[PDB]
Each structure stands twice: as C-alpha cells, then as structure tokens.
Design a protein around this ligand. Structure first.
Ligand SMILES: [Zn+2]
Lengths: 94, 191, 286, 332, 283
C-alpha cells in the first residue's frame, strides 16, 4: 500500500497494524525476510524498516488501468528525451 | 500409363481392433493398401504413392516416393489408437500432393474409412467443392462397415464427380470375411 | 540449456532468398526450413540452411505439412558436401510465433533433440536485430496447472567468419557511414536505444489497454513482472544519489577539460607553424 | 509571379507609345505564356498595312516560342495573308530557308575525314568517323564521303550499320521536301533483303530529318511501327516516332509506345521509354509519370531502366518547382 | 551474332558469399562449383545461387567426383522453388589473381558447347580484403576480327590487370563486367546485420573501470606532454629533409596526444550523456 518513494515503515506503525508489541516487530520482519515475502533491512537505532520489494500480487482492472497510466507517463518522458537528443544533435547525425 | 500422385489415407483408429474383417481390420487394410500400391506402381513405373494416417489429428508417414518398400515397411507399427479426423486428414493429403515432385502428374487420394466420420454434411460438401476446383480425385473405401452405407460419403463422392465427372469412386465392402484386396476391383482397373 | 545463438549472415541471406523465391511462386505467407550448424559448449553457431517444402491452411492451425523425406535427403547431401555441419534447428520467416510452431518443433526434435527455432523477419518494421531465438521447454505452473510446452527466449546475435565479413563489407556499398566517433556513439545508441525502449513500452501499453477493456484475459504472470519492473524503476531525488552523480560528473568534466586544453595547445602550435611557413615562403618569393 | 507582373507592366508601357515595340511585347508575351495577346496583335497588324511587322513577329515567335504556344496562335488565327503567316508559324518557311543556307554555305574539308578514315583501325573508330561525318554534314544534304567510300562503309555490321543508316537522316536535317523516296532509294526494297538494322536506321533517319516537325511522317511512322516485327525495327521506329512527335502529347503515339514498352524487351524498351519521354515532354502528365515510374520499378532490364531514366527527366522538362515530389522520390 | 561488351553478369549477395566462403575454406586448392541462373536478354546473365559439389584433388588440380549429386541437387532445388539451371561454373584461384588456365579453358569449352553463353567466375579469397573482393567473369574467343561489338563505353571501364593479360586475357578469353543488383529485402537485411540490441545502447559502463581508464590515459598524457615539450624545442634545428625521417623509429608525442584526447573526449561525453538520459528515462 505504501508508495514506492516512502516505503519506510516504522516500528510503532507495524505494531499498531499487526496488533503486536514493538519488541516482536523485529522478529516478525526477520521471519518475513527469511521466508522471502519482503526484501529490505532493519534499523533498530532509528526504529524503522526499509522495504525495497514486496511479493507480486493479483491486481484488478482498476489497478491495471493505473499501471497503464503510469506507463503512459513513462513513454511520454522517453519520447520527450528522444526528440530532445535528435533535435539537438541533428547536425552530427542527419 | 497415366501419371498419378496418389496419397493413401489409412485409418489407425480404435475401431480397427475389430476382427470382423479377416484377421483384424488393421491387417486387412494392410493387405488392401499393399495391393493398391503395387497396382499403381505396375500401372506406371514413374507413378509415386505416399502414406498418411487418420489418427487423433493426422500424421504423414511417407511423402510421394516411387518405391513401395519404404511405404510398406512404415506400415508396420501402425498400432491403432484414437479417433478419425477425415476432414483434417484429407486436407493434409491435399497439401502434400499439391507439393508434388512432378507437376505433370495427376492428383489422387485413396482413403480407407474404417470408422464413423464425425464431420457434418456441410463441411464435407465444402471440402468436396474445394477439391473439385483444385482437380483432385478421391477414391473412398467404406471399410470397417461401422456404417457400411452413404455415411456422408456418397454425398462427398457424388459432389466430387458431379456432372458425369466419373473421376471419384466409393467402393462399399460388406462385413463378409473376404480379403479387402479380393473385394476391390473398381478403382484398381476401371478407374 | 543454450546460452547464446550465433547466426551467420549467409543463413539470413539464404532465408531471404527462400522467401523471395517462394513468394514469386505465389500463394504463401511464411517460409520454413532447416538450420545446419555446430555446438561450442553452450554457444550455438548456425552456419548454413536449406529450404524445405511447407504448407499450411490459413484458417486451421492443425493442417500443416512438412516434407521430412525431403528434409532427410537434402540433409544427407549437405552432409556429403560438408560433414562438420549437423542439423541444429529450424527457421521460419513468420513475423511472430504461430500456433503450429510447437508441433513443427516436435517434428524436428526427432532430428535434433535440442532444436532451436530462429525467426527471421525479412520485412522488419522496427529498430533492432532481425533474429529471435526460441527453445522449447516444459512449463510447470501453480494455478495454470496442466504443464504445457512453451517456447523460451534465448539470446541471439550475428557473427561472421573472415570470408563472410569480407563479402558483407564489399556488398555494403549501399549506405556506408562508419564514423566510429561520437557521431556513431550517438546514433547507434542513445537514439536507437530510446526508440526501442519506446517501442517495447508501447507494446506493453497496448496489451494493458486490451486487458483493461476486456479483449484479452488477465495474465497474473505478466502483471507480476510489470509490478517487478515498476518496483525496479529507481529514485533519482535521493540526496546520496545526487551527490554521487555530481561527484562523478565533476571527475569526467575534469578529464574533458584537460583534453580540450591539450587540443587547444596543439591547434596553437599548428597555427604558429603555418604562419612561419607562409612568412618564409613569402620572403623567399620576394 | 513578380516577374510576370513586371513583364505585364512592361507590355502595357510598350503598348502606350507612339510606335509600340511589338517585337519586345511579343517576347514578353512568350514569357507570360499568353498566346491570346499575340494572336490579337497579329490580327490588328493585318487589319492595318503592317505585313512586315506581322512577318517579323511570326518569325521571332517560331524561333523562340514553344510548340504549344505556336499551335494556339495558329488555332486562334484560324478561328491570303493569314495563310502566309500561318505557314511562317508552322515553320515550313524557316526550315526551308535554313536548309537553303546550309546547302549554299557548305565549306567543309574532306581531307580531314580522309585522314581519319585512313587512321581508322577498328569498329569503334569506324562508327566514330561515320558519326563525325554526319555531324560535319548535318543539314548540308551532301553525302560525298559515304558515296565515294562505299566499300569502306560496308565493313560496319549490326548497330554500326544502324548508326550508318541514321547518319543519312542526320545529314538531311530539314530536307522534308521528299524524304520518303529519299530514304527508300538508300534503303532499296528487294535489294539485299534481310537487314533489320538498316530498316530501323531508316526509320530513325526519317525521324531525325523531321525532328520537332512531324505531320504526315508521324502517321507514317505510326503505321510502320504498328506493322513492325523485328525488335531492331521496333527500336528504330520508336526513336524516330519520338523525335517526330517531340512535344506533342499525342495519345495515339503515347499508347503505341506504351504497348511497345510493355512488350518487355530490352532493345525495344530503351527506345520506347526515351520516345515516351520525348512525346510527353514538358507536360506534367500524372498518367505518364505513374506508368513510367511503375514500369521502372517493375522491370528487370537495365537497358529499359536507362531509357526510362532519360524519359522521366524529359517528361518533367521546364517545370521548375512542380517537379519537387518526383525529384525527391527518385533521389530516395 | 554480336555478343556486346555492355553485357553484365549479375551476382546475388548469396552467390557471392557462398563462393567466397567455399574458396577460403579450400585455400590451397581450386575448389569449384556450379552457378544457377537465367539468361535474360543478350545483355544480362543473372546468377542467383551457387552450390558446391563433391570434389577431390591436389594443390595442382581439382576434379568433381560424382555427377549424380549435381543432377539430384538440381532436381531437389527445383522441387523447393529454384527452377533455374546451370549457367556457368566458379572456382577459386588462391593468390594468383583472376584468370583461366588451360584446364579451366577446357572446362569452359565444354560448358560453352552445352550452352552458348555460359560463363566462368574466378574468385580469389586471400587477395580479397574487407572493402573489395577480387572476382571476374570470363568467356572464350573462337579461333578467329574482334570478339565483341562495342555499342557503349560500359565494357572499357576496368583496365585489365597485368597478370590476367600475361595469362591470356583478351587473347584466349574476354572479361564481363560484374554487377551486384539487389532487392529491397536483401538491402534491408545487409543493413540490419550490424545493428545491435537497443539495451546495449543505453547500458552504462562500470564506473570503477571507467575511472581507471581515465586515470591511466591521463598518466600517459603526462609523459607525452614532457616529450612534446622536448620535441617543440626541436623543429628549428632541423633540416627541411631531416624532419620527415626524424619520426622514424621514434614516438610522436603530438600524434599520441591527439589520439588520447579524442578517445578521452568520446568516452567521457558518451558516458555523461548516457547517465543523464537514463536519469530522466528511468523515473
Ligand atoms: Zn583455374
């Protein structure tokens, strides 16, 4: 659920969501990592977990359309840069 | 004397287990295609004959080859299994004898239907008209006697040779335990 | 398992010739044939090929015919002419995989157990290599359950011997532009790479549009791979990444600046020499 | 566009004068491509007693105006002086006068040709010296060199004989008074029969004699080409017919040449393409361009391709910026 | 009755590559094969394909061992869509240039007797280099006059080689121009051969290795600059002739500095531009 740019959960949040005390959060996250559900690290000093990859899941058509929109943005950026390079270097590449 | 590229469509279906027609319909049909291949070779030394099975979907065993030893040898290990797909088999045979070695040769298909055909009348007549346009003759043997009648086959042959074409044939053999080679006399001589 | 397939230019040009001749004959869309070659410990090498009679019904994906007797005869003759080449796979010019390809591959596996399919697009409306290599593999699912025979991609590249390279370079007097410098390093990449990436993303977008509207059903594996891609997309606003990027850019520009200074000094040297020569020549002529 | 406007203003200024400069006005009108004005001016001059103006103007028009421009001025006039003027625009008088001038002033040194003939040692130089003689005597009606060196000319064979026969037409440039019998005498019937090269050269020579000025020769060559059987004869006839009909978009000639082209023969095809270009010269006929370019892209004969390559450029003659699309496509 | 000099032999890309590959494979011998094609007009002899045949011989001669193979190959190619029949033969002369010997002339005589316009093609593999391929087409002259008629300049554009002239060119045989007409698909495939994958273009280059290479080249440029300073002090105490031989067996600091500058500029500019392009494209 968390967006890719933050994707940095905290011990209290995990405890509240999973109905377990803050102490067991580390063991829960380590079990997840060991099994292979999520990938990341644990920073006890700052009391945070940096999740970098969660297992793929089945998505509905609304989420597929969201992925399509994101692809549209990505393709627009690619085309913009291609046009920039072509226009600026037309002199050397004709 | 007439050049002819004749592809044989043999039926290795599960109804060939039946022993009604001599020592198993498989062996009866083996002898039948033996006599037919020998007859074609004797009729013309340059004549070329091949082999196709009408198993679950289809299988081409020996494309047009002037010799018959390879065809007969491959005929062994034709153990029966599966259903019969008449339309697909005949289409594959049509393609194979469209890709002939010699284009002056004529085109023929000898089919051994020893099992019911599940193709409707409309598809079979459509195939008949297509083959008539492409100038193919289809000699059909109503082997097996699973219906021993115009089991959507007389319509096929009549559509083929319509308007006094007298090119195709339909020899229907009774379950009489008489060698299928002994029974066949129309296509071999009076073709 | 194949790690790479090397397709020599003669194979490609022979495929083109086969396609052209069958097309001149008429009434055909795809061409098929055999790929003779050799093995180099998981690095294939396709060196030669020969045509094979082949026909198919444009409606039924189950009425197709391949003359394996002719295949065997021509393979015997090719072996008699060059022993070191043995059947390795089959090729077809169809723009994309057809549904009869697994059946044809099963037929050819009786001549080469590790048969490799190579699709050669003789009319490439794209920007990339013309060869795509596939190997038949059994796929075991978790919900798709029945294990089907699917085609798995294998890296394909074009290599050449010395004679083939010489011949291709001689024939390449159509449009020759080497310019190995920054010009080629800007055209062969950058522009080409961005265009190809846009093409692939457009293909993904078209498939996603079809899925969302409802023309095609959902493929959980494709959706999972797309999730992985979008996860891999990096973030370029991180302070650490920005700082590292600036550091490396500064180093590269240091080297560039030193090179430009060397260039300027050399240019000045040339100007001084030229002026000396011209002044001396004028003095001597006077 | 601005040049045309300025030329129109100049024409108006010429008109509004005590003694208008009708000659310069006709030049500017040729530039503007307005045969109506020149026809009107000629009509006014005849209505007056300025036959000298009329004759000089018509001479200048024939000498420096296009055939379509001349034809319109000959159709506007039509719909004793008028017959005389039209005979000037039709070009008969000018051709005859030039022929007379060249016949009378015919200073040419035959010693140089004799030296070249003696030095000749191969077929290439033989055909070269035949061509050089034709160039030297173009329009002079004289064939003394060929007449005296008859046994030396017989060495030429094949296309050398073709060129040798066409040299006669080159020499007799404009000698249209009696060309049919003049060529028949050189190419006698039932005399050494079986020289397709000679017959084709004769047709080519008639075309060269009547170059840019056809008439009955167009129809004669059309019939001869239709009845032709040998490829050499067809090639010579195509070249001659193209030269005769040069500039006149005659659909019958175009269709006959197109059929000869589609016959798909190299020797016939080259001449057919060149003749199509010559016939539909200047005109931007989309049909002609389409047919020629399509056949160039469809044929498998480099000779036909060469002929059509010249023909297309001839077709697009004159048109400055109307040729951009074709130029770009052909270059690509 | 002419045989003109504007006649050309059209060799397909496939035929040329097959010929060169077989010839190079048989480097010491004169390996040989047949050419299939059509006789289009009197100004074209189209060669569309060639196939080698079973042959055996020494470094002084090569001969075919079976004709059954040739017949069967012709039939089995016709069956797959190549009805073209033999129009000549090709064999390789490894390093002797292009010409025909006595045995070659006898073979060409047999081929001429069969078909009037049959041609022989000699391809020399080892003398061929990347840009150019040494290949020529030949036909014989009877015991007569001039062998051919010239109706154009196309024939006289090749300047026959001294070796061919010594070995009998224009006396026992004459050459025919070779042309390489191609179709659209052949052109496109030849152009596409060298095209690389798109990802290779955007792929970056290990920064450790890149920095190491930059460091190495700059360190080299330092010594080159020392030597350049030393060399600049010369070129005034040097004879106008002595300058040319001054750079024989001795390094040229100016040239090496220019080369290093070019390589460094290309590498660094490409890397920076690729880095920026990726920075934008990938989020
Ligand atoms: Zn030799």
């Amino acid at each position: 659920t968390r967006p890719a740019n933050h994707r940095q959960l905290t011990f209290e949040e995990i405890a509240k969501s999973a109905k377990i005390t803050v102490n067991e959060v580390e063991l829960l996250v380590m079990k997840a990592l060991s099994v292979g559900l999520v990938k990341g690290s644990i920073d006890e000093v700052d009391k945070r977990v940096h999740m970098t990859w969660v297992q793929p899941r089945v998505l509905d058509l609304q989420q597929i359309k969201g992925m399509k929109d994101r692809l549209e943005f990505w393709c627009t950026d690619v085309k913009s840069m291609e046009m920039l390079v072509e226009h600026q270097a037309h002199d050397i590449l004709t | 004397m007439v050049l002819e590229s004749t592809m044989v469509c043999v039926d290795n279906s599960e109804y060939m287990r039946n022993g009604d027609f001599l020592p198993t319909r498989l062996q009866a049909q083996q002898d039948a295609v033996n006599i037919v291949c020998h007859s074609k070779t004797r009729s013309n030394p340059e004549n070329n004959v091949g082999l196709i099975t009408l198993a679950n979907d289809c299988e081409v065993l020996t494309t047009l080859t002037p010799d018959t030893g390879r065809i007969l040898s491959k005929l062994h290990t034709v153990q029966p299994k599966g259903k019969i797909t008449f339309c697909t088999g005949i289409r594959v045979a049509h393609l194979a004898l469209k890709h002939r070695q010699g284009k002056n040769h004529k085109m023929r298909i000898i089919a051994f239907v020893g099992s019911p055909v599940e193709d409707n009348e409309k598809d079979l007549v459509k195939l008949a008209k297509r083959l008539k346009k492409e100038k193919v003759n289809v000699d059909i043997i109503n082997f097996g006697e699973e219906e021993v009648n115009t089991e959507k086959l007389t319509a096929f042959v009549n559509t083929l040779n319509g308007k006094d074409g007298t090119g195709s044939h339909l020899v229907t053999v009774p379950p009489g335990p008489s060698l299928a080679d002994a029974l066949i006399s129309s296509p071999i001589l009076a073709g | 398992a194949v790690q790479k397939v090397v397709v020599h230019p003669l194979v490609l040009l022979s495929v083109v010739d086969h396609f052209n001749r069958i097309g001149k004959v008429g009434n055909q869309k795809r061409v098929v044939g055999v790929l003779l070659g050799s093995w180099q410990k998981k690095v294939l090498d396709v060196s030669n090929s020969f045509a094979v009679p082949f026909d198919e019904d444009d409606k039924d994906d189950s009425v197709w015919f391949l003359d394996h007797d002719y295949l065997e005869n021509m393979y015997g003759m090719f072996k008699k002419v060059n022993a070191r080449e043995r059947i390795v796979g089959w090729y077809h010019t169809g723009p994309k995989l057809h549904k009869n390809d697994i059946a044809i591959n099963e037929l050819m596996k009786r001549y080469c157990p590790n048969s490799v399919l190579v699709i050669i697009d003789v009319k490439p409306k794209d920007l990339g290599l013309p060869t795509e290599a596939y190997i038949s593999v059994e796929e075991v699912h978790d919900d798709g359950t029945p294990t089907s025979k699917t085609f798995e991609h294998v890296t394909s590249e074009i290599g050449a011997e010395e004679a083939e390279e010489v011949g291709v370079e001689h024939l390449l007097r159509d449009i020759k532009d080497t310019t190995v410098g920054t010009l080629s390093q800007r055209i062969t990449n950058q522009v080409h790479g961005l265009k190809g990436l846009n093409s692939k993303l457009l293909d993904i977008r078209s498939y996603l549009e079809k899925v969302a509207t409802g023309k095609l059903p959902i493929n959980h594996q494709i959706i999972y791979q797309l999730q992985d891609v979008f996860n891999l997309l990096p973030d370029v606003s991180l302070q650490e990444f920005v700082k590292a990027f600036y550091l490396k850019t500064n180093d590269q520009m240091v080297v560039v600046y030193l090179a430009s200074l060397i260039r300027s000094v050399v240019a000045l040297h040339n100007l001084i020499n030229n002026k000396i020569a011209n002044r001396d020549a004028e003095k001597k002529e006077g | 566009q601005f040049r045309n406007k300025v030329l129109r203003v100049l024409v108006k200024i010429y008109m509004n004068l005590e003694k208008p400069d009708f000659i310069n006005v006709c030049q500017c009108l040729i530039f503007l491509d307005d045969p109506q004005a020149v026809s009107d001016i000629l009509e006014k001059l005849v209505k007056e007693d300025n036959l000298l103006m009329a004759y000089q103007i018509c001479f200048d028009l024939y000498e420096s105006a296009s055939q379509q421009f001349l034809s319109s001025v000959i159709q506007n006039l039509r719909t004793d002086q008028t017959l005389k003027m039209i005979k000037i625009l039709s070009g008969e008088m000018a051709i005859e006068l030039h022929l007379q001038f060249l016949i009378r002033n015919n200073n040419t040194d035959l010693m140089i040709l004799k030296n070249t003939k003696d030095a000749v040692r191969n077929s290439v130089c033989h055909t070269a010296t035949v061509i050089a003689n034709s160039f030297m005597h173009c329009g002079t009606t004289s064939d003394q060199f060929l007449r005296d060196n008859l046994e030396w000319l017989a060495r030429a064979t094949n296309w050398a004989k073709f060129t040798a026969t066409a040299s006669l037409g080159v020499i007799h440039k404009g000698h249209e008074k009696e060309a049919l019998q003049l060529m028949a005498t050189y190419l006698p019937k039932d005399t050494s029969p079986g020289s397709a090269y000679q017959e084709g050269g004769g047709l080519y020579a008639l075309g060269l004699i009547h170059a840019n000025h056809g008439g009955d020769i167009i129809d004669y060559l059309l019939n001869q080409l239709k009845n032709a059987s040998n490829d050499i004869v067809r090639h010579g006839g195509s070249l001659g017919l193209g030269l005769a009909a040069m500039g006149t978009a005659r659909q019958d000639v175009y269709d006959l040449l197109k059929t000869n082209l589609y016959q798909d023969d190299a020797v016939t095809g080259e001449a057919a393409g060149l003749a199509l270009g010559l016939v539909m010269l200047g005109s931007k006929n989309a049909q002609a361009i389409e047919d020629m370019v399509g056949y160039a892209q469809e044929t498998q004969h480099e000779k036909i391709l060469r002929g059509l390559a010249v023909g297309i450029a001839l077709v697009m003659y004159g048109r400055m910026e109307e040729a951009d699309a074709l130029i770009e496509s052909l270059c690509r | 009755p002419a045989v003109d000099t504007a006649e050309q032999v059209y060799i397909s890309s496939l035929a040329l590559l097959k010929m060169l590959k077989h010839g190079r494979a048989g480097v010491p011998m004169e390996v040989m094969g047949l050419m299939l094609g059509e006789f289009v007009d009197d100004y074209t002899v189209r060669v569309i394909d060639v196939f080698a045949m079973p042959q055996s011989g020494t470094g002084v001669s090569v001969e075919a061992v079976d004709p059954v193979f040739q017949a069967k190959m012709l039939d089995m190619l016709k069956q797959t869509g190549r009805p073209e029949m033999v129009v000549g033969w090709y064999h390789s002369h490894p390093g002797f240039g292009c010409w025909l010997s006595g045995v070659d002339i006898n073979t060409q005589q047999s081929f001429e007797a069969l078909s009037e316009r049959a041609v022989a093609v000699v391809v020399d593999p080892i003398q061929s280099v990347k840009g150019k391929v040494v290949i020529d087409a030949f036909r014989l002259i009877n015991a007569n006059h001039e062998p051919r008629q010239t109706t154009s300049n196309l024939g006289h554009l090749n300047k026959p080689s001294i070796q061919a002239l010594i070995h009998g060119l224009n006396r026992h045989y004459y050459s025919i121009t070779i042309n390489y007409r191609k179709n659209e698909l052949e052109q496109k495939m030849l152009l596409n051969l060298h095209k690389k994958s798109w990802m290779e273009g955007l792929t970056l280059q290990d920064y450790s290795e890149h920095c190491k290479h930059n460091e190495s080249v700059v360190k080299e440029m330092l010594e080159l600059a020392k030597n350049y300073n030393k060399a600049v002090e010369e070129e005034d105490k040097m004879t106008p002739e002595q300058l040319a031989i001054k750079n024989v067996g001795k390094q040229d600091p100016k040239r090496h500095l220019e080369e290093h500058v070019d390589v460094l500029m290309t590498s660094n500019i490409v890397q920076c531009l690729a880095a920026m392009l990726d920075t934008v494209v990938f989020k």
